[PDB]
Design an enzyme around this catalytic site. Structure first.
Site, PDB file in Angstrom:
ATOM      1  N   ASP A   1       0.833  -1.194   0.000  1.00 55.44           N
ATOM      2  CA  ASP A   1       0.000   0.000   0.000  1.00 55.44           C
ATOM      3  C   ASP A   1       0.872   1.251   0.000  1.00 55.44           C
ATOM      4  O   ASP A   1       1.756   1.405   0.848  1.00 55.44           O
ATOM      5  CB  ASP A   1      -0.926  -0.004   1.216  1.00 55.44           C
TER       6      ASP A   1
ATOM      7  N   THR B   1      -4.189   5.465  -6.258  1.00 57.39           N
ATOM      8  CA  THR B   1      -3.493   6.450  -5.437  1.00 57.39           C
ATOM      9  C   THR B   1      -1.983   6.353  -5.625  1.00 57.39           C
ATOM     10  O   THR B   1      -1.284   7.375  -5.631  1.00 57.39           O
ATOM     11  CB  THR B   1      -3.867   6.263  -3.966  1.00 57.39           C
ATOM     12  N   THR B   2      -1.466   5.134  -5.794  1.00 59.10           N
ATOM     13  CA  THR B   2      -0.033   4.956  -6.001  1.00 59.10           C
ATOM     14  C   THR B   2       0.411   5.544  -7.337  1.00 59.10           C
ATOM     15  O   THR B   2       1.483   6.152  -7.428  1.00 59.10           O
ATOM     16  CB  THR B   2       0.324   3.471  -5.921  1.00 59.10           C
TER      17      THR B   2
ATOM     18  N   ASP C   1     -30.043  12.146  -5.671  1.00 57.02           N
ATOM     19  CA  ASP C   1     -29.460  10.864  -5.292  1.00 57.02           C
ATOM     20  C   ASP C   1     -29.806   9.773  -6.297  1.00 57.02           C
ATOM     21  O   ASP C   1     -28.991   8.876  -6.542  1.00 57.02           O
ATOM     22  CB  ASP C   1     -29.927  10.465  -3.892  1.00 57.02           C
TER      23      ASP C   1
END
Lengths: 74, 74, 492, 505, 78, 505
Positions: F44, F77-78, F371
């Site tokens: 991670d 994200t990486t 929604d």
């Protein structure tokens, strides 16, 4: 090397040179029987296959002829 | 030749077993394809045989010497 | 950091310019330099300081070559050219911080130097060589910086009349090496002989048999020397061999009709044998020996002759032409003069003779008259004269400041810094005189606005235009040769 | 790694010394000695490199390479060192990011250099216009060389033959396109000009004297009298006739190679040695012609004018480069058999037949002819210029990008980096002239990228302008001389993996 | 502002002075947004007169106050 | 001098920890404490960066970038830090040998990112094929979201309006293209979908309610009674009639602003504020109708449907972005006049008019509709993927090279440097795969250059294969999320000329 362009000329020089110095009996080539001589200047296209010693000489005095006479069919 | 030594060695071993027994070498200079037999590239057998005999003779003389003795310089 | 290597040379060059800056003007600060050999000399001349300074810095030695050409061409401004050179180097420091390449800095100096000359010629009053009243007052003011004052009135027409004969028209560069100041012991300053033909450095033969005077003589240049061979019936055998060797040389001299000959001075062996003087005495041939080696190249030009190395190649066409050759000695001089050469290739080369008693007389007089010939030389190559003391440098900075807006790009900013670099010369003159630095500079821009070149004219201060022109031209090439060096390495 | 660093970082540090001196607006450098009073200042690049002592053994190799450009031509010596230094900057980035033998990268430079020379040819111009003024000067210069030579008997006849032997070439000026045929028992005034390739010692007996649409193939084999030296080999045979049977069995295997000759679609085969009657008789049914006494020189000169190649072996059938000639005429003159080749496709060549009265007059006329033609043909590559001002430098850059389309996986960075070194020339010239290299080169490449770009580097206005209007040109001979020298200079440093430190003096 | 806009600070300064002299008297400043030429007046970019006048008064007063202090006295700590 | 190194080279070391952890075959990192017994091994990227204390003050900027990416989607994200590290690594060459302003480099990324997103759109695929089964399941999902909401009364009619409000957009699915009107005195079952852009207010008094061939122009200005606060002023006049002269002088100046409007040939005008009778009466002769009370969305949404512009000023006459519509119809429903536009050129939008019986039903229906539409709009960004395995990374490099053709001198090296970072993504993925990254990326660019845009790199076979046959795809929403995050993160870092360390909390 750059010699690879004229390589076709140097290929036929080693065919006749080994046959003369080597006999099919022993099938051996002596290093002392091969004279390796070279000088600076000229090109690689003027290399010729000679069956004998070169022995560069200026013939001393210039009046001497550049050829040897047969001396009456000797 | 600028190629994978392990990846190439595994290829030469596979062509000489599953397909048929032949001679296929590694090309250091760029050529058309493999199978130098088509290009008529030959090497002397007794010339290669003399190399493997001198290699074993040189390897023995190294292992047979367990001691190093040398004097100084004055 | 290829530029930081050059920046280290610029800082070292500004330190030399600041040292010479204090020596500008007659009121400047002298510099004391002690040589490694032990000689202690002092003077305010910037050319003599940089010559004995023995600068080991490679770039800083460029000021020596410029100062050598400054005295050889203009003859004045060797100190001011160093200050002007350091001014552009100081302004180039802020230029490198802005990312400006020195090529634009060097190329803009060529357009700035040529523009400053055209602006200076507009305000300069063009003068002609036909008026002799202007040349007398010009050379007389240059002699007011020396101890000789009242006796300098007779020396003013001496330097003027010598240049006007060789000036002619459109002569461009006129070499002053042909004009030599003869320094002899005895006499006075008021006693001077022009001798427009030529003047030698040596006396004549004081022995017996020498004619010492000849009419209609041909003076040649011979580098050979007549001496017995120098690599006891026996006594006469040596004499017969020596007299025959000395006579064979004299045989070709009589057939060549040589009245006067010269012999190069050699301290190794004998110059001229005493027997050779008696042999040529019967032939009425004047002999002058012990000729200095320095005068060999000098006599090969003004006389229009050529040196003869071997007698075999000696001919008559290599001789000279003289109407009368005599030896006139005022007191103790015993000098030979020649008049009326009348050579077509050669010109009227004039050698000025200076007489004096004490050694300090002929010395200080030589350097005083040498600078006077340089000022006159400036007027021959470039006509016109301006008032010295930094007066024209103020108006040039004012005109270039307004014309800087006409340009565009990076080169426009260089014109603004170039105008400020020209104000260092008048500022230094106000500092070395004891006056307030900034106060005098402000008074220059105020008065020069209404008036034009108006007072140094009442004070008889006249600076030739060629000095102010060459000072900017040589500084543009000197600063250029500096910034163009981006590195230096050991080469042998 | 220091072996390459000494040939890269050590060479770049020395190469950057004369790099800033390129061009008239370039920088300058001082050369200082120990005593410092013997120093001097100059802009010469070759002088600075040779004067500075360098203990780096890799830097001494570059000095000997730069001496070749001075002896061969002598122009643009500094540009060769500057361009060779930029090739090391890109090669250093290719190695450290690879760590593979550079010899593979060297092969990429040879393929990229071929596209650079072809791009300069199409855009090349010349001063050869108004040949009428150049032709009158060519015949006058040739008559001056004839002085002291036996050819001075008649200047008009000999100079006229050399005039049509130059301007009519329309190609390479090498003497390999000029055949020299000399015979005995004739007059020098009877010499004539011929555009054909002439042999002697006519081939064959019953072969026809007229051949239409002849093909040329080069090969080396002996079909007659094999086994030159049989002495020394042990001979065990039951009968004597079995000795000649072994020679027939060896020549029997040649039938497969002879069968491949007819498959090539050629009507003529050339061989240096002789041919036995049996394989020669089969040439009649297959329509094969046998040419003899081809020697070596005449073989190379024939393959170039006919667009052929020379090989001594057969690698594979139906693959080769062949020439052709329409008509072959066999005549006889001077009591000697002659051969004539004509009708070659795009054939460009000529043959001057000189008739001497002895052997001494033939050797003096041939050597004097080569010296006269070499001076006249020197003006072909002289005065010829190309469009300069960074234009032609960028043309070579975009030509490499064409090769970057079809390329191998590991050979792409080798070819792509060669185009980056070609764009370093306007970068150096912009820095030495005091301009922005990043601004000028960026706008220079975008315009020349596709089509209709005459623009170039303008140093007067500090922008990109058309060089054809300003008249800025550079010699074409200088272009090929620098590229060929810099290409060979980079190979010397890359082909050396380990550099031993030289003996300090 | 010319360095922050990616332009030559010396070349732009000489350019602004040339356009306001030979052509006509106007106000042309450094380009805040990317454009190809001068005369930002078309964009109607204005600044207050009292705002620009207050800056030059405080900058002049600050430069005078700095010259009025010739010594820096900094006491130590206990 | 060290601020650029810490913001560029110092930021690389932060991204080096997540560099080798990208991909399923990527490497792992170790997080060790003082006791060393609390450690763990994981791939991670968000855990490693937050756990390791960073003394680098410039490294804290990338910390907030990963937190924004995690809100959108928990994947990729990486890849955000890795892609941002390649842009900062090439920034070193953007300074030394380039000397280009950093904002100009950032502006070059916006032009490159615009072509990169458009190139991925044409090459994007989806599972929406056989829409008959896909469009039917859209109404069933919307009915599940109706739980606990008052719209649960009728599932068929209320969910049908939300289904046609999505697919009929043919464009951005954001709620900014949907107009919601809250009105009273009706029932929720009478609501219908209408694209006529219905708003509450009317315009004009004696003007007709039907307009044919209307030209719409959007501008914001106050033409009536500026300086709304009159308290504090002092009027010095010699007479009462002289005080009104200043107000009458302003009316004469209104013709300058009206002349620019009359030259545009528009019958429809947009104004947020009011208009005095005199400039409105002059619009009657010209036939100009002014719409009032446009709020904010009404100003922006009108320019989107009609193809207008939101600028309130005129920089030059007869140059602007003008819209149009075929028919403007004004109807009346619920005792209030409504405005229904018709025939908008290339208009794409929808307006759901919610008619409730009270204020409580209007606020609950609008929040519940957003929604429900959010789930339907999510299906456009979900399940839609693109060809991966080096494919999409190389295709983006082709669009950057297109913009790199025509470019100025400053952004030439900036746009070209962005294309190098795009090829670094398949290079790093091939690093941890155990194969040669330089060979795979090189052969991939030459293949896609001419034809074959669907090719990619195969990690299993280590060669180029068809991505459609292998079935390896990556989400398209992930591609835009990483590029948008890297563009905003690199925009701040490249502008940094100095580093101010944050105060510890």
């Amino acid at each position: 090397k750059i010699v690879s362009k004229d390589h076709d000329r140097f290929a036929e020089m080693a065919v006749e040179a080994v046959i003369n110095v080597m006999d099919k009996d022993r099938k051996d080539v002596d290093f002392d029987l091969i004279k390796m001589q070279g000088r600076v200047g000229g090109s690689i296209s003027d290399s010729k296959l000679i069956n004998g010693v070169i022995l560069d000489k200026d013939f001393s005095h210039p009046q001497m002829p550049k050829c040897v006479l047969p001396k009456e069919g000797s | 030749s600028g190629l994978d030594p392990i990846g190439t060695l595994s290829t030469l071993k596979s062509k000489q077993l599953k397909e048929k027994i032949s001679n296929i070498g590694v090309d250091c200079l760029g050529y058309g394809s493999n199978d130098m037999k088509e290009l008529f590239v030959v090497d002397p057998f007794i010339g290669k045989k003399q190399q493997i005999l001198l290699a074993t003779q040189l390897c023995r003389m190294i292992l047979k010497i367990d001691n190093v003795i040398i004097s100084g310089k004055d | 950091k290829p530029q930081e290597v050059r920046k280290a040379n610029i800082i070292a060059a500004r330190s030399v310019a600041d040292a010479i800056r204090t020596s500008l003007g007659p009121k400047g600060m002298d510099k004391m330099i002690k040589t490694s050999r032990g000689e202690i000399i002092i003077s305010n001349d910037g050319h003599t300081i940089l010559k004995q300074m023995a600068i080991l810095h490679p770039v800083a030695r460029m000021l020596v070559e410029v100062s050598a050409a400054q005295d050889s061409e203009a003859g004045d401004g060797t100190t001011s050219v160093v200050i002007l050179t350091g001014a552009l180097l100081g302004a180039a420091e802020r230029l490198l911080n802005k990312g400006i390449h020195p090529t634009i800095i060097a190329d803009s100096f060529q357009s700035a130097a040529k523009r400053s000359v055209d602006i200076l010629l507009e305000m300069c009053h063009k003068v002609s060589l036909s008026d002799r009243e202007q040349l007398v007052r010009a050379a007389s003011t240059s002699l007011s910086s020396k101890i000789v004052s009242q006796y300098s009135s007779f020396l003013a027409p001496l330097a003027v009349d010598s240049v006007l004969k060789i000036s002619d028209e459109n002569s461009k560069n006129v070499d002053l090496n042909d004009i030599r100041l003869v320094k002899k012991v005895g006499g006075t300053i008021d006693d001077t002989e022009m001798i427009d033909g030529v003047v030698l450095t040596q006396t004549a033969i004081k022995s017996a048999g020498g004619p010492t005077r000849k009419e209609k003589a041909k003076i040649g240049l011979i580098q050979f020397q007549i001496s017995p061979p120098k690599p006891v019936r026996q006594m006469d055998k040596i004499l017969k061999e020596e007299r025959a060797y000395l006579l064979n040389i004299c045989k070709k001299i009589k057939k060549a009709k040589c009245n006067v000959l010269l012999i190069q001075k050699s301290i190794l062996r004998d110059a001229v044998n005493d027997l050779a003087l008696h042999f040529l005495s019967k032939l009425n041939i004047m002999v002058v020996k012990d000729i200095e080696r320095e005068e060999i190249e000098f006599l090969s030009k003004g006389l229009g002759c050529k040196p003869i190395a071997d007698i075999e190649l000696f001919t008559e066409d290599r001789l000279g032409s003289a109407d009368l050759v005599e030896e006139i000695d005022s007191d103790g001089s015993k000098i030979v003069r020649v008049t009326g050469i009348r050579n077509n290739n050669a010109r009227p080369t004039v050698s000025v003779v200076i007489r004096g008693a004490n050694n300090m007389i002929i010395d200080e007089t030589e350097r005083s008259l040498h600078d006077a010939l340089c000022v006159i030389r400036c007027l021959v190559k470039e006509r016109g004269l301006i008032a010295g003391g930094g007066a024209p440098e103020i108006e040039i900075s004012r005109r270039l400041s307004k014309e800087a807006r006409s340009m565009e790009g990076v080169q426009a900013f260089i014109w603004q810094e170039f105008a400020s670099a020209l104000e260092v010369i008048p500022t230094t003159l106000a500092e070395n005189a004891g006056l307030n630095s900034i106060k005098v500079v402000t008074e220059l821009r105020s008065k020069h606005e209404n008036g034009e070149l108006n007072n140094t004219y009442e004070e008889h201060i006249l600076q030739p235009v060629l000095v102010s022109t060459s000072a900017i031209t040589l500084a543009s090439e000197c600063v250029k040769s500096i910034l163009r060096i981006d590195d230096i390495a050991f080469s042998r | 790694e220091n072996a390459r660093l000494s040939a890269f970082v050590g060479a770049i540090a020395v190469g950057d010394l004369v790099k800033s001196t390129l061009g008239p607006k370039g920088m300058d450098k001082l050369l200082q000695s120990a005593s410092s009073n013997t120093c001097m200042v100059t802009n010469d690049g070759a002088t600075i490199l040779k004067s500075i002592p360098l203990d780096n053994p890799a830097a001494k190799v570059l000095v000997n390479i730069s001496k070749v450009q001075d002896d061969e031509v002598g122009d643009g010596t500094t540009s060769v060192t500057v361009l060779s230094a930029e090739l090391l900057r890109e090669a250093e980035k290719l190695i450290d990011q690879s760590k593979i033998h550079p010899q593979t990268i060297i092969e990429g430079y040879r393929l990229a250099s071929a596209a650079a020379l072809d791009a300069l040819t199409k855009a090349a111009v010349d001063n050869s216009h108004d040949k009428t003024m150049f032709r009158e000067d060519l015949i006058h210069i040739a008559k001056t060389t004839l002085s002291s030579k036996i050819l001075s008997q008649d200047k008009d006849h000999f100079a006229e033959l050399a005039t049509n032997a130059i301007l009519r070439l329309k190609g390479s000026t090498n003497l390999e396109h000029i055949q020299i045929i000399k015979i005995l028992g004739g007059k020098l005034s009877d010499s004539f000009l011929d555009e054909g390739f002439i042999l002697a010692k006519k081939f064959g007996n019953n072969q026809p004297k007229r051949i239409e649409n002849a093909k040329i193939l080069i090969a080396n084999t002996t079909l007659d009298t094999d086994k030159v030296k049989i002495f020394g080999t042990k001979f065990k045979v039951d009968s004597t006739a079995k000795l000649a049977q072994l020679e027939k069995a060896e020549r029997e295997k040649m039938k497969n190679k002879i069968a491949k000759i007819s498959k090539f679609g050629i009507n003529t085969f050339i061989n240096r040695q002789l041919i036995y009657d049996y394989p020669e008789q089969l040439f009649t049914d297959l329509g094969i012609n046998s040419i003899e006494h081809a020697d070596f020189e005449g073989v190379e000169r024939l393959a170039l004018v006919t667009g052929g190649e020379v090989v001594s072996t057969f690698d594979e059938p139906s693959k080769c480069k062949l020439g052709e000639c329409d008509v072959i005429e066999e005549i006889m003159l001077g009591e000697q058999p002659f051969l004539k080749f004509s009708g070659c496709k795009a054939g460009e060549a000529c043959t001057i037949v000189l008739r001497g009265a002895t052997d001494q007059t033939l050797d003096e006329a041939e050597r004097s002819l080569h010296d006269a033609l070499s001076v006249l043909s020197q003006t072909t590559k002289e005065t010829r210029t190309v469009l300069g001002g960074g234009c032609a430098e960028m043309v070579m850059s975009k030509a490499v990008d064409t090769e970057a389309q079809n390329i191998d996986g590991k050979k792409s960075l080798a070819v792509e980096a060669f185009a980056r070194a070609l764009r370093q020339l306007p970068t150096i010239l912009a820095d030495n002239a005091g301009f922005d290299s990043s601004e000028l080169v960026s706008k220079l490449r975008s315009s020349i990228y596709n089509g209709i770009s005459t623009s170039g580097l303008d140093l007067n206005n500090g922008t990109i302008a058309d060089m054809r209007q300003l008249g800025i040109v550079e010699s074409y001979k200088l272009k090929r001389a620098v590229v060929s020298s810099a290409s060979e200079a980079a190979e010397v440093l890359l082909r050396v993996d380990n550099i031993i430190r030289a003996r300090p003096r | 502002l010319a360095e922050n806009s990616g332009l030559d600070p010396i070349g732009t300064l000489s350019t602004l002075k040339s356009k306001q002299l030979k052509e006509k008297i106007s106000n042309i400043g450094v380009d805040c947004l990317g454009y190809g030429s001068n005369d930002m007046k078309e964009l109607f970019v204005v600044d207050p007169f009292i705002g620009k006048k207050q800056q030059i008064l405080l900058a002049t007063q600050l430069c005078r106050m700095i010259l009025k202090i010739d010594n820096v006295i900094i006491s130590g700590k206990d």
